[PDB]
Design a protein around this ligand. Sequence first.
Ligand SMILES: CCCCCCCCCCCC(=O)O
Lengths: 171, 171, 171, 171
Amino acid sequence: EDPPACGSIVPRREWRALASECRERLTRPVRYVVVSHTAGSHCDTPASCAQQAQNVQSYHVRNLGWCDVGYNFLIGEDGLVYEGRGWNIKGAHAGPTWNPISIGISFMGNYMNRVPPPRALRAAQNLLACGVALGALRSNYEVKGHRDVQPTLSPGDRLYEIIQTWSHYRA
Amino acid sequence: EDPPACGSIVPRREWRALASECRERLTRPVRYVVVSHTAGSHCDTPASCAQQAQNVQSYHVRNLGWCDVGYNFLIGEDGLVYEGRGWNIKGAHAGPTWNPISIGISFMGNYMNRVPPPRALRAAQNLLACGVALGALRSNYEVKGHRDVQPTLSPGDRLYEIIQTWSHYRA
Amino acid sequence: EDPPACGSIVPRREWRALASECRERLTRPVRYVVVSHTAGSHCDTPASCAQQAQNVQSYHVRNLGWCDVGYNFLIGEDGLVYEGRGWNIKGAHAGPTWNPISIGISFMGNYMNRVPPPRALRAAQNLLACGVALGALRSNYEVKGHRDVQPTLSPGDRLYEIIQTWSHYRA
Amino acid sequence: EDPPACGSIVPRREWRALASECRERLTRPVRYVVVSHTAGSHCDTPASCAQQAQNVQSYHVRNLGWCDVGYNFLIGEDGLVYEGRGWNIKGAHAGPTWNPISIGISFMGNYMNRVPPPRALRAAQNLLACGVALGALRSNYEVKGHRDVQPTLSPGDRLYEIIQTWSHYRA
Ligand SMILES: CCCCCCCCCCCC(=O)O
């Protein structure tokens, strides 16, 4: 009865993230998950994927002036999960309505016309099962695509198509 | 007391807009303009363009349950401006820091891989001068790309590449 | 839609209400909730709170000439919701812009220098969730104070501070 | 930190409850609901019903030596529900055959020559649906009276006839 029976996650340190200055918290257990895509280039090795997480945060903090990278977690095609703001901190990925009540996970890449590789799909689903196991998400949490709550094409046609079949998907 | 022009704006009732539920006001003169794209299909006839203004508002209100189409104005490839929420109503186009202090205009189409036709651009430039002439915009207003204030590809590489050249543009 | 309903509400007859003469319907689902106070005497027991309901309806019907008590629901410090005009009928609580597009709930008493007990707040928020569940309110409904849409102290300095913190609150 | 639980439950600490020491968990969702009376005093205000819940729980804890008040929830004549051991903790209210399979709720007074007011019955029905809504209760649950499962005069003569008229009430 391991108190934390879930998940390999690449932590901030390891992907060389800038220290976060977000303080605003979510309230566990969290009800909604919104799946996005970064919409840039993908990345398929740990060194490449850790670079990409760095660039993303670089955009949100350097350019856009945010307190941290927007997403709670990002999903690489190396098939690891990168800690974004994580389970406890409100992200900025889906507007002032969905942000304080969800967890935004973003796949790194562009899935308009490309599907994530199986290992990235498993990483993402294992990550959700682990949120439930941890009490961070509700046992009956709901998955939305980004496009379901914000006017956008994110998470891309081929990914949208996939998340829709998921156990917890609810539009 | 001088008012001139200046709308060749196509008014909501003409493009068969559903009636807006929004009540929140911008305060004039408005300092900022944010230029997005719909990421959508483009339209080059006053008939398709009216029909697209519908489909775009239909997305925001029916799908997303918003009070109205998120943009203050939209821009067809027909060379006409489409009235959205207009000059005095807060729009929902660039998040909660920029929505209340800006006008958002969006070009109907996806401009990652096309430039909008020059008449589309003349329409947008003439809008903005109208706004100044009305006292809706500050004479020295500033223009931003959507991707400059929010994480997105909007308004498209090509379109973005154009707006960087505008006199009122600002880093 | 559904056999019986959600949440508990003291019915019109139970608080000895005069029959309604109102017929203007609201349009489901409603986007706005406006929270007032009555600035009248407060009460903390089902007996005294029913009495108070009556006195308010009475002032509205007999002195103001309204078809019924202006509020859709009233709220007692006894922790009970009193049925006003209900989910379906247009109230008179927020003036002619807001009355046709909102549900008006009023806490019975004056909340400038005191707060309503946790039980009143709970009942209020409860009511509201039931509104959504019935499909009388939008799921993305927005709460406003009376002072946000009309110039008035209502709902009273201390209660306004409170509703500011509600999830659905948009000034 | 979000909107309160459905049901408008007066939380433990609001009725000045001694802390629970119970830890046997009920496995959701529960099939049976058992209705009892307390046979103690009865109370018609929030003040007097807080106190009465105190007194019942005191009797259970200090005198009988139980981990907490025996009932999952108590119901006041003030029209409120008082959180006992709640949705997730096995109670002690109907003996060892009935406690591990059910949620016990009890009305606070003697219902032999009296009935609880309509508000008290409203609270309870409301509690039970909020049960389902949470996922604590079977969508398709069965309600049983105390005298049906254990030799007793509980829930009184009058209360007991009433609940037999409830829909969910089983033979
Ligand atoms: C999910 C069934 C109906 C939900 C209606 C809203 C009442 C709240 C129940 C959800 C539980 C919670 O918010 O903790």
